[PDB]
Amino acid sequence: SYYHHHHHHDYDIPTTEPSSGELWGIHLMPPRILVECLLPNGMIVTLECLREATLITIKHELFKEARKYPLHQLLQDESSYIFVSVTQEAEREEFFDETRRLCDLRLFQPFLKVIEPVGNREEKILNREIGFAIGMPVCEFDMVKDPEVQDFRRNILNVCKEAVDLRDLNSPHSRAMYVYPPNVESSPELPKHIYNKLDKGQIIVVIWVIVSPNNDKQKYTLKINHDCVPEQVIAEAIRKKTRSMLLSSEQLKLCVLEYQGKYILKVCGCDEYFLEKYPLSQYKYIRSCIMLGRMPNLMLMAKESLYSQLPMDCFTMPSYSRETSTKSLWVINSALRIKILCATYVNVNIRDIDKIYVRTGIYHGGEPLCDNVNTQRVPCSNPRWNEWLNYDIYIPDLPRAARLCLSICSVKGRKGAKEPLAWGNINLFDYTDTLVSGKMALNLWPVPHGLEDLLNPIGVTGSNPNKETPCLELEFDWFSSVVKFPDMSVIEEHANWSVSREAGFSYSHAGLSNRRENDKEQLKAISTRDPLSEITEQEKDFLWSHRHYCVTIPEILPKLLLSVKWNSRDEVAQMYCLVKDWPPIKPEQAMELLDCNYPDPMVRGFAVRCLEKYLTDDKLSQYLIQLVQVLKYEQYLDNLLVRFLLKKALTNQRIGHFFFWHLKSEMHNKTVSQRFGLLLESYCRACGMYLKHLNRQVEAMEKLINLTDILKQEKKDETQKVQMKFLVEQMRRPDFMDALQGFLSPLNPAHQLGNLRLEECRIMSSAKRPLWLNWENPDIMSELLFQNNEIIFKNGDDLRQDMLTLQIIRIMENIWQNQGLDLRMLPYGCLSIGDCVGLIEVVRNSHTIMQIQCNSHTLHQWLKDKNKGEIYDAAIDLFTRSCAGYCVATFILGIGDRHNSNIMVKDDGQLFHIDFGHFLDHPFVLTQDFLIVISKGAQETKTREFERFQEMCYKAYLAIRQHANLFINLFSMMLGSGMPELQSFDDIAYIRKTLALDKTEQEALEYFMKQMNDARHDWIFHTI
Amino acid sequence: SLQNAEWYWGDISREEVNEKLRDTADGTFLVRDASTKMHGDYTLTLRKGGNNKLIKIFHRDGKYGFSDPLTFSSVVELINHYLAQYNPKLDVKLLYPVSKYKKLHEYNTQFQEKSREYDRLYEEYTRTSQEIQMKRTAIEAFNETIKIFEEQCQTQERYSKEYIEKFKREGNEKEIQRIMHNYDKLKSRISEIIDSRRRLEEDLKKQAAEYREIDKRMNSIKPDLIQLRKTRDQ
């Protein structure tokens, strides 16, 4: 994190009492190349350039050496031209910035065309930056010809204008508030066990100031009540230099007032600023300093010297800014019936004719009708059916979100005597609320690994972008006219009416419709269940009955919603109306409503409001992975949730940064490449001069991807030493020195990376070749007061699972600390940037248990080294505390693979698991080693201390259990990313077991115990 | 027949019945052991409408049923009536039951090694797809390169056709012949680029074809995989 989670065990107050490659094919161009230059005089002069050559200097050389060829008077000075070539994204590119190195242009073949700036838009054409950042040239969009895409691009700027306006509104302060959000917890209240590190109620907080034209430091130590705004913290610093024997005190009291708001505090060592009236201890730095035995070190600094470096002013609307006859849907008489025509091909071997048919189904997550295959009749060759398929549903009863799912597929039964391919999904409704009709050709997707479920309605809706694929041609009914979903006006009418119909009560032979309710409505007991609980037919109906009573308990909504007969136009209209003015619910509850059980525009629209109002920028920054994950189930490009996210992300740069990486990391992923590509564009167009930093992180990550691509693969499977020879050489090269020095850490943009420590970066020893890089912190107040910077660039392991686990642990920890007491986890930094490409933060000063050996007791002796005598007691306080957290969490999340080279111990005494990857199911930990460190040395488990350890674990387990839901939902939202451990609710079931859930509280505490004082017991492998 | 029939599975939980009922006719059923227990509760899972419906069988004092007036008491007697009566939205009866049917070392080791190759074929499959798409996008870059050099010819006939005559008379020709050399390489150079693309084209068409084969075998392993998996647990 800040200080590398290194506790100073001493602070009882009293101090004074695709793929990369530069050039197609070749991973690395030779030290020198022949680049052919095609001149406007018409002549190819072939020019010999070193690869690092800048374009300014290639131009020079080209023009010098061109006047040695014919037609040379037929020239134009030199700087009139600007190179153009073809990049390996198959596009022609004007190379306006002529600092760009030859090795850096993503050229295809070494040639450059010389032309003239026709287009004359040096400015707008430098939205080549927008394409770079996104990775995908901006204008694969300009040539799309789908009205939804072109619409989105236009309509989404409303948000960009609005957001860019909000930023400048309140001129200079809001700009800084945006570029530098306050990094702040969401409750100002301090948990009592922190209060008791400042048992006075207050904290010592050094406040440095830079004085020399070449920096000179003054201290002023200062002491103040934890809960004191920075405004006031600046004051007490004034009243300390200013204090004087000539200065009376209303003389000082005034002029404090008068200078209090002309300064600004800043965390020393990184780019974090205290720009808001927040309780000093509410800032993560501060609370984190209390927590590690640390003296806050702030930097006083004049507001006006910060505001001078904030140049984002410009936002430009881009070049792409510039009624028939309808029947209201339910006028339509008689059932839906879709015509299946013919697939063009299919990859079956034909010497195996379990023949071929199209399975189909109308759906709303789970289907709203009996679903039906067409006759097997066709024996491939020319897969054709020509048949209409009859689905039993009135067209009037089609829900808004209703869509059709189909596949081509095969199964079995054929052994003995008893009784797949490619799937595709389609929105029965336009984004314009039209119900589709006519010719539809659908390119289908490949079946994803594992899922042999025959119909896959969780896969996206859309035709396959790749048209070299089996393609199923379709026909929907066409009525007299264009058929639209009815206006919201109309629906609310029908709702009203068919409840005024309801007061025709007459017992009847049914149970769903029935409406008082006695004391035995106590089925507020169901409101309390977790969202995977499973709701019985009896219960589903009980709910639709006492629906109008439900308003008095808002949080039933998810369950009531899963009880609506989503194929009843009556019931849905009535539901629509309840959702209309439903008391809003806690953000952690609304989120659920954005998974794929709740697809209905009205419902999801509601969640987005509950978020707009209640969810704080903190909590956003936290559950962001899910929110970005969950756009994938929005039916259309332009929806409420994007307009939300995107607005937030242009409004708070710290969100922005990750909003962007989380989207960029899946750009390789074709099912989602354009929705994300589209999203990413609007964001860069509107993000101000941050794009320039992002571009630098991208520039750098590519160099990194490429370098590792040679370290495995492109031979370089030489002696470890040889490989290192290459790395060292290659880093020294000037293209690389530029690319990889002085840019913001993707793990934390507040973390400036300066120049490399070349003699500290090395290739780790894994099959995949993980580059361990060290940068200087170029902050003035860096090395004392803070740190030097280590990250792992790892190219091969898919880091998403680790990412999510580390998210969940943070949250877990977050819960245990706010409940009071107090198990310290180490949610180290992890960020997925690409197709299995990622960055991991080095937690400096940790070693694997399986290093510490090179003793069964001497793990406890290693701990009594590093921690001397008195300090030593808190190392057991720490080790014991962290072991619990990971015992409890490791158990709940179900992590096997728990061997001593996966668990690390840090010098201060802290424990923390690393390298997760493998999820839930796909016993417990407790080796003697650990069990020896708890119970300071002894061998006798029945110890005074081990008893306490049990209370922590009991208290903790149950804390998570109370907070089941958040966790069930956090996992729930994940089901649409390529992650191969979370594809079904089936998969999530694991943690529903591990937290007992189905049993009582008292029962679950008993079961966990039935898990705790168990486990018991060469060490690299295991034997006898 | 009492606490131990065809459809009584008990020992299983929500996830297992979910997959056993997969794609079956309106009426496929079994009974289960419910979550919270008063010394015992039971759950019937009926097939209707394309979905699994959970129905709670109650106890209370010592008679069974679905709702308020609990009559049929012996667990089995309740299923023996069957669902028409209790609500009309469940009109279908209980058609399909479910029921049950390292010694078997040998008839599983095929599931090990045929699945060996399906986790090896999905690989060949994934890699080829990316790899093909690369070749597709490289071809795109080729034509585009080709279109530049071609346009360089245009930029040369014009510009040198009105000088293949001016230099012809200037008293000093001879320069015009060291110009043709450049045209000779230009047209020589384009031909190479055209071949380079061609060779890639007839590498894609044969890379593409290869992919169809990797698929063909996969769709033919797939169904044989499901049968062993099912000759195993049952």
Curated annotation (Swiss-Prot), chain A:
Q: Output this protein's name.
A: Phosphatidylinositol 4,5-bisphosphate 3-kinase catalytic subunit alpha isoform
Quote the annotated effect of R992Q. Answer: In CRC; uncertain significance
Q: Where is this region: Catalytic loop?
A: 894-902
Impact of mutating R101Q? Answer: In MCAP; also found in a glioblastoma multiforme sample
Q: Which species does the entry assign this protein to?
A: Homo sapiens (Human)
**How changing Y990C affects the protein?**
In MCAP; also found in an endometrial carcinoma sample
Pfam families noted in UniProt: PI3_PI4_kinase, PI3K_C2, PI3K_p85B, PI3K_rbd, PI3Ka
Q: What is known of its domains?
A: The PI3K-ABD domain and the PI3K-RBD domain interact with the PI3K/PI4K kinase domain. The C2 PI3K-type domain may facilitate the recruitment to the plasma membrane. The inhibitory interactions with PIK3R1 are mediated by the PI3K-ABD domain and the C2 PI3K-type domain with the iSH2 (inter-SH2) region of PIK3R1, and the C2 PI3K-type domain, the PI3K helical domain, and the PI3K/PI4K kinase domain with the nSH2 (N-terminal SH2) region of PIK3R1.
Consequence the record notes for mutating E537K: In MCAP, KERSEB, CRC, BC and HFMH; somatic mutation; shows an increase in lipid kinase activity; oncogenic in vivo; occurs in the interface between the PI3K helical domain and the nSH2 (N-terminal SH2) region of the p85 regulatory subunit and may reduce the inhibitory effect of p85; requires interaction with RAS to induce cellular transformation; enhances invadopodia-mediated extracellular matrix degradation and invasion in breast cancer cells; increased AKT and RPS6 phosphorylation in HFMH patient's cells
What are the site positions for Implicated in the recognition of ATP as well as PIP2. Also crucial for autophosphorylation of the p85alpha subunit? K768
Enzyme Commission numbers on file: 2.7.1.137, 2.7.1.153, 2.7.11.1
Domain spans labelled C2 PI3K-type: 332-486
Respond yes or no to whether keyword Signal is given for this record: no
Keywords from UniProt, A to Z, are: Angiogenesis, ATP-binding, Disease variant, Kinase, Lipid metabolism, Nucleotide-binding, Phagocytosis, Proto-oncogene, Serine/threonine-protein kinase, Transferase
The miscellaneous comment for this protein is: The avian sarcoma virus 16 genome encodes an oncogene derived from PIK3CA.
This chain's function reads: Phosphoinositide-3-kinase (PI3K) phosphorylates phosphatidylinositol (PI) and its phosphorylated derivatives at position 3 of the inositol ring to produce 3-phosphoinositides. Uses ATP and PtdIns(4,5)P2 (phosphatidylinositol 4,5-bisphosphate) to generate phosphatidylinositol 3,4,5-trisphosphate (PIP3). PIP3 plays a key role by recruiting PH domain-containing proteins to the membrane, including AKT1 and PDPK1, activating signaling cascades involved in cell growth, survival, proliferation, motility and morphology. Participates in cellular signaling in response to various growth factors.
Variant or mutagenesis effect after changing G119V: In CRC; likely involved in disease pathogenesis; shows an increase in lipid kinase activity
UniProt region (G-loop), positions on chain: 763-769
Q: Give the domain of life.
A: Eukaryota
User: Which stretches make up the PIK helical domain?
Assistant: 516-686
According to the entry, every stretch annotated as the PI3K-RBD domain falls at 200-302
Zinc-finger is among the record's keywords: no
From Swiss-Prot, chain B:
Cite the post-translational modification comment: Polyubiquitinated in T-cells by CBLB; which does not promote proteasomal degradation but impairs association with CD28 and CD3Z upon T-cell activation. In adipose tissue, polyubiquitinated by the BCR(KBTBD2) E3 ubiquitin ligase complex; recognized by KBTBD2 through the SH2 domains, undergoes 'Lys-48'-linked polyubiquitination leading to its degradation.
SH2 domain location is 7-98
A GO molecular function assigned to this protein is: insulin-like growth factor receptor binding
PTM Phosphotyrosine: list the residues.
Y122
Keyword annotations for this protein, in alphabetical order, are: Acetylation, Disease variant, Dwarfism, GTPase activation, Host-virus interaction, Phosphoprotein, Protein transport, Repeat, SH2 domain, SH3 domain, Stress response, Transport, Ubl conjugation
Cite the record's tissue specificity text: Isoform 2 is expressed in skeletal muscle and brain, and at lower levels in kidney and cardiac muscle. Isoform 2 and isoform 4 are present in skeletal muscle (at protein level).
Q: Does the keyword Glycoprotein apply?
A: no
Q: Listed GO cellular component terms?
A: cell-cell junction; cis-Golgi network; cytoplasm; cytosol; membrane; nucleus; perinuclear endoplasmic reticulum membrane; perinuclear region of cytoplasm
What GO biological process term is on the record, naming one? phosphatidylinositol 3-kinase/protein kinase B signal transduction
State the disease linkage annotated in the record.
Answer: Agammaglobulinemia 7, autosomal recessive: A primary immunodeficiency characterized by profoundly low or absent serum antibodies and low or absent circulating B-cells due to an early block of B-cell development. Affected individuals develop severe infections in the first years of life.
Q: What is known of its domains?
A: The SH3 domain mediates the binding to CBLB, and to HIV-1 Nef.
Known function: Binds to activated (phosphorylated) protein-Tyr kinases, through its SH2 domain, and acts as an adapter, mediating the association of the p110 catalytic unit to the plasma membrane. Necessary for the insulin-stimulated increase in glucose uptake and glycogen synthesis in insulin-sensitive tissues. Plays an important role in signaling in response to FGFR1, FGFR2, FGFR3, FGFR4, KITLG/SCF, KIT, PDGFRA and PDGFRB. Likewise, plays a role in ITGB2 signaling.
This one is known as Phosphatidylinositol 3-kinase regulatory subunit alpha
Q: Which organism is it from?
A: Homo sapiens
What gene does the UniProt entry assign to this protein?
Answer: PIK3R1
Report the portion of the entire protein shown: 327 to 579 of 724
